[PDB]
A paper describes a structure:
Human ORP3 belongs to the oxysterol-binding protein (OSBP) family of lipid transfer proteins and is involved in lipid trafficking and cell signaling. ORP3 localizes to the ER-PM interfaces and is implicated in lipid transport and focal adhesion dynamics. The ORP3 ORD displays a helix grip β-barrel fold with a deep hydrophobic pocket which is conserved in the OSBP gene family. The ORP3 ORD has a central ligand-binding tunnel with a flexible lid covering the tunnel entrance.
The structures of the ORP3 ORDs in apo-form or in PI(4)P complex have a closed conformation of the lid by the hydrophobic interactions between the lid and the entrance of the hydrophobic tunnel. Structural comparison shows that the closed form of apo ORD has a very similar conformation to the PI(4)P-bound form with a Cα rmsd of 0.49 Å. The ligand dependent conformational change is limited to the residues that recognize the PI(4)P head group around the tunnel entrance. Two conserved arginine residues (residues 512–513) make salt bridges with the acidic loop β3-β4 and Glu794 in the groove formed by the β17-α6 and α6-α7 loops. Leu516 is accommodated in the hydrophobic pocket formed by helix α6 and the loop β17-α6. These interactions seem to stabilize the N-terminal base of the lid favoring a closed conformation of the lid. In contrast, the lid of Osh4 lacking the upstream residues is completely open and disordered when ligand is absent. In the asymmetric unit of the crystals, there were two molecules of ORP3 ORD related by two-fold non-crystallographic symmetry. The dimer in the asymmetric unit seemed to form by lattice interaction during crystallization process.
Numbering used by the authors: 512 to 860, 862 to 887
The structure:
Amino acid sequence: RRTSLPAPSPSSSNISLWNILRNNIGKDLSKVAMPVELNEPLNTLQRLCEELEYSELLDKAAQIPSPLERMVYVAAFAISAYASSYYRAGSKPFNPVLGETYECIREDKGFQFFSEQVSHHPPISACHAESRNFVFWQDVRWKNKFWGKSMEIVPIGTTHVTLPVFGDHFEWNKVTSCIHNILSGQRWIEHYGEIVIKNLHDDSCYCKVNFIKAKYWSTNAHEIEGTVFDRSGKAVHRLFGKWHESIYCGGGSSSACVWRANPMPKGYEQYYSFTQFALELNEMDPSSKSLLPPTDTRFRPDQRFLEEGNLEEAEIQKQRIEQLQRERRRVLEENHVEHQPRFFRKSDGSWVSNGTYLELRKDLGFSKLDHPVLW
C-alpha cells in the first residue's frame, strides 16, 4: 500500500475561510458552499472508517474471560477514535454525495467495511463493518457551526460494537469538539462531554471517560480520566493518559499502557497530515477495480483530482456533481419520492445494514444495473 500521494497538499489556501466563516457565524456549515481547495481527499464515510485504525484493541477485547477488562479495552478503542483529529484539527472532508458508498476490505486487520451516504438533507452517513471478533456499526450526522473564533463539531448518533464469542453489546456516545482559533495561529482542538460505555447484555459494569479541559499549554492538556464502575458505583479500574498519545489501565498498585497512537508518516505535513492509515483509503489497486460498485469514493473525480494536485479539475468536477445532485433531489421531489438508501435500512431511528452489501459483492462483477450514476 502506498505511503505517498501523487501530489503535495496545499500548505494553506485558508484566506478563503476568513470571509466565508465570519460571514456565517451561526449557520450550519453543511448548508454553506466552499472552494474545493479547503477540502481534503477524504470524505465522512472514510472518516468513519478511520475509527478502526486501532480495531485490534477489539481483536484483543473479546479474547479475555474478564468482562471488566473487555470494557477497558473497549474504552480504549472508543477514545482512539479522537486520536486522528490532533494533527488534522481544521480540515473539512468531502460531504458525501447522496447515495455514495465506500468499501474497505482489510484482510490485514481482518474486517470488511462498507458505508453509504443515506441522506443529504440532513447529511447522514451509515457504516457497517464485519470481523470474526467484532461487528462494528454506526450512524452519524454532524451539526458543525462556526462561532466567532472556534469551530464546533457536534456528532449525533451512537456507536455500537458487539463481540460474538461473548455476546457483548457495547454502546456509547460521540462527544462534542471545539477547534479553538481555527482562523488564528495555532489551531488546537478540544473535546467536551462524558463518554458512557454500556454493555446492554451485561449489567455488571459501565464505563465513564471524561476529557480534561485545560489551558492549551498546561501539562494536563489533552488529558483523559476514565473509570470502570461496577453496578454499585464503586471504582474498579482507572484509565489515564492523553487521547492523542497513550492510554493506561491501572493507576494504582500496577499499571499498563493499553493503547498507543501509531506514529505519523514521514513528513506527514506535506500530505494533509494524514495517518498512514488515512493515506491507504483513497488508494485504488488494480485487482479491486473490478469488484466494487461505481459509487465507491475512489471513483469520485474531484476527490482524485485533488489527491492529484489539479485544483482546476477538482473545482470543475465538484460543481458538476453538486448541481447534478440538485437536479435529482428535484427529480425525485416532483415524483414525491422518499429516496431509500441501498444497503442500509432505518430501524428505530438508526440506519443499520439491511444485510446485502457483503454477499452482493460475494459473487464477482456486480454490474447488475448499478443504480444511479453519480459521476
